[PDB]
From a paper:
Aminoacyl-tRNA synthetases (AARSs) catalyze the attachment of respective amino acid substrate to its cognate tRNA through a two-step reaction. In human, there are cytosolic and mitochondrial aspartyl-tRNA synthetases (DRS and DRS2), which share only 22.9% sequence identity. In the case of DRS, it is one of the components that forms the multi-tRNA synthetase complex (MSC) in higher eukaryotes. In the MSC, DRS is known to interact with the AARS-interacting multifunctional protein 2 (aminoacyl-tRNA synthetase-interacting multifunctional protein AIMP2/p38)8,9 and the lysyl-tRNA synthetase (KRS).
Numbering used by the authors:
A (entry chain A): 21 to 162, 173 to 223, 248 to 272, 283 to 495
B (entry chain B): 21 to 162, 173 to 223, 249 to 272, 283 to 495
Write the structure that this text describes.
């Protein structure tokens, strides 16, 4: 009845844009010592809460960042307000007005360690229902299984790890596009109703020259970042561009996303990703030699098995101190019909895979731009020419020599951070 | 022994990466007066050619740009070489070596008008078959039907108009992402087995500012989508969306002028107009405007297409803009997730945006409250059972949020004043 702090708290009216307050909401991550003794408004989630005596301690979380808030009986809060605060369901969103105060000793369990928020006002703007299916702290500790997490995506995506993973994942897309655009590339929009490659090659035959696409690829669905490029005389022109683009991504991530890399590292310990400048390139023959030295028995025209890729990747990592490299000149026999044969060594092909942490992320080649040869290769592979006639015909009115290849975003995210399986890098996994 | 030019021209071996020549191939766009009297190597398409006497003129095309080249009996080329050049099938790709020469009359049929290429060497690196299904000059004149042009896509995409259209379209995507990212957005990848559900999940998962680009749906177009938590009023988002479009329009007009002109030539279009900041009109104001024009409309009626088109014309005449916002549509014509106006309950916190009198975006503040969402869903006669998981995502705290999306082809088409969306779709299927 009496309570003096009544106007300073509670659950507020649903936000329906009835007003535009004159008010600045500061980000948790900007609660530093620079703001000491300033009054601020903060919107955050109630991560957790504890109360004793005349005090309520809260952890206020904004994504990756979190801060301590204290509600204490005095000039601002009544004991009624303290109690209200202590009872706010976890994951509720609150608007808090408080003074930023320096603390004598660092608040070790928060990202904002040098200050705390002394609450003068606190309103629940969105009340969470009491039954949390998942606890955020559980979800991030190095227990919560694949199942509940995948069942409760909205909750799991809130964790500092999840935020880090997908913010970085968006960083990969951004970096890929920007690098490609600055190299003169044009983004294209492939339909899905005839796999991304057919269209990219069409665009090359249509004078596009440098193209990329980013989109669903398919009963599994994933996200492919695809490159196709006309070149002057040698496919190494394209191979090198692709490798350099990967390198710009790794550079950019380590320069701009260090905070998220360190966040994921806290849950899933991983050595920083290593790469050379320029990229290491090895020929198939050298790989065969290395594997044989390790006592692996392999034919000169065999494909690399997964276990052998992993070993070679370990060998390369030991020998060259790199997690990223290109393997070039695969046997023509293991590659797809549209693959250009090697002109010096006719057993081999103008084709390449690239690997991260000993796992294949890209499989490209110089394509065959000549109708006759393409047809000849297709015949050798037993392909019915009738069902690929439209594809072959697209090269008959002049086509430039070209090459390309693509990556899977989730895959590249998983390997860069050294995660357990792609599911850990798919926002909406199935299943 | 008659042909002195034998080594200078011919059909070259198939490019199979058998060599890395020390050779720089210069872009046709770079052939200018600045390069006069330089020897250069150029790779290009034989767009057209003509021959008489001791001379062969070719138009060498490298995408949007083209240059005139001259093979002529002299120190380098023989009669034989001239004859060979004269017989290269159109659309073949050639590697040409030649000197850049200042010409005194503008070569007004080319983009490179100040210079021509005096050929010293010419090789076909890719020989085109003889009978083209489609002539490129026909497909760009204010002639070729939509029909042969969809059958022979690879050829059609080659026209200076297709090049300009799709280069600019890629530029739209770029500017859309870039602006949003600078405003702090995160790109998300939504599955296709619509993005709205998923965008709202991310907002409920504390991502705050998400966008997605990808296929939308029995037709498929490309969607550029935004969703954004805000502080107190959905105008915070509406403004961010409108401003993103402003950044797109500006960047196109700054950086894609030659491609805008290329399309203008084939399909005349007044330059696209917009205000800074974006014009916003409320529903009531639009009704008043339409009534003055003699249209009869109920207060809670949805804007018909003919009525949008008229309204667009009216705002163009009065405010001099091709882009505007209409705010506060009636609640009854909007989707169940649309938040009602807290002040006028017949209206809603919803908006459409228009380019040249046609709708490109339809957004609202969404309902981030489980109870109200459910009510509203009931009102719309939706089975709560089949949207259960959607509602359930708002049960654990959600911020107030708004969003809206555009169609890429549609926005390209309306910016350029084009006739239909097929013109702006790279791979159409009827």
């Amino acid at each position: 009845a009496e309570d003096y702090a009544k106007e300073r708290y509670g659950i507020s009216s649903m936000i329906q844009s009835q007003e535009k307050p004159d008010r600045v909401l500061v980000r948790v991550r900007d609660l530093t010592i620079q703001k000491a003794d300033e009054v601020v408004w903060v919107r955050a989630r109630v991560h957790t809460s504890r109360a004793k005596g005349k005090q309520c301690f809260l952890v206020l979380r904004q994504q990756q960042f979190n801060v301590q808030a204290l509600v204490a009986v005095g000039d601002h809060a009544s004991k009624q307000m303290v109690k209200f605060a202590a009872n706010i369901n976890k994951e509720s969103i609150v608007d808090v007005e408080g003074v930023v105060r320096k603390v004598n000793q660092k608040i070790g369990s928060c990202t904002q360690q040098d200050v705390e928020l002394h609450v003068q006002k606190i309103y629940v703007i969105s009340l969470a229902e009491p039954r949390l299916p998942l606890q955020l702290d559980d979800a991030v500790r190095p227990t919560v299984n694949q199942d509940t997490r995948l069942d409760n995506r909205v909750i799991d995506l809130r964790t500092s790890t999840s935020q880090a993973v997908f913010r970085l994942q968006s960083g990969i897309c951004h970096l890929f596009r920007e690098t490609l655009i600055n190299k003169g590339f044009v983004e294209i929009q492939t339909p899905k109703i005839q796999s991304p490659q057919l269209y990219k090659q069409m665009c090359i035959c249509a004078d596009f020259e440098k193209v990329f696409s980013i989109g669903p690829v398919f009963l599994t669905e994933f996200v492919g970042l695809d490159i196709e490029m006309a070149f002057n005389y040698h496919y190494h022109e394209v191979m090198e561009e692709i490798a350099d683009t990967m390198v710009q991504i790794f550079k950019g991530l380590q320069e701009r996303f260090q905070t998220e890399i360190q966040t994921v590292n806290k849950q899933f310990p991983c050595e920083p990703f290593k790469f050379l400048e320029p990229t290491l390139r090895l020929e198939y023959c050298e790989a065969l030699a290395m594997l044989r030295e390790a006592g692996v028995e392999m034919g000169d025209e065999d494909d690399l098995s997964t276990p052998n890729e992993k070993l070679l990747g370990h060998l390369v990592k030991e020998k060259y101190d790199t997690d990223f490299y290109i393997l070039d000149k695969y046997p023509l026999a293991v590659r797809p019909f549209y693959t250009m044969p090697d002109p010096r060594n006719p057993k081999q092909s103008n084709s390449y895979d690239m690997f991260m942490r000993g796992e294949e992320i890209l499989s490209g080649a110089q394509r065959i731009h000549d109708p006759q040869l393409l047809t000849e290769r297709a015949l050798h592979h037993g392909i019915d020419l009738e069902k690929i006639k439209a594809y072959i015909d697209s090269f008959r009115f002049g086509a430039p020599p070209h090459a390309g290849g693509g990556i899977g975003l989730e895959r590249v995210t998983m390997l860069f951070l050294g995660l357990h399986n792609v599911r850990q890098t798919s926002m909406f996994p199935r299943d």
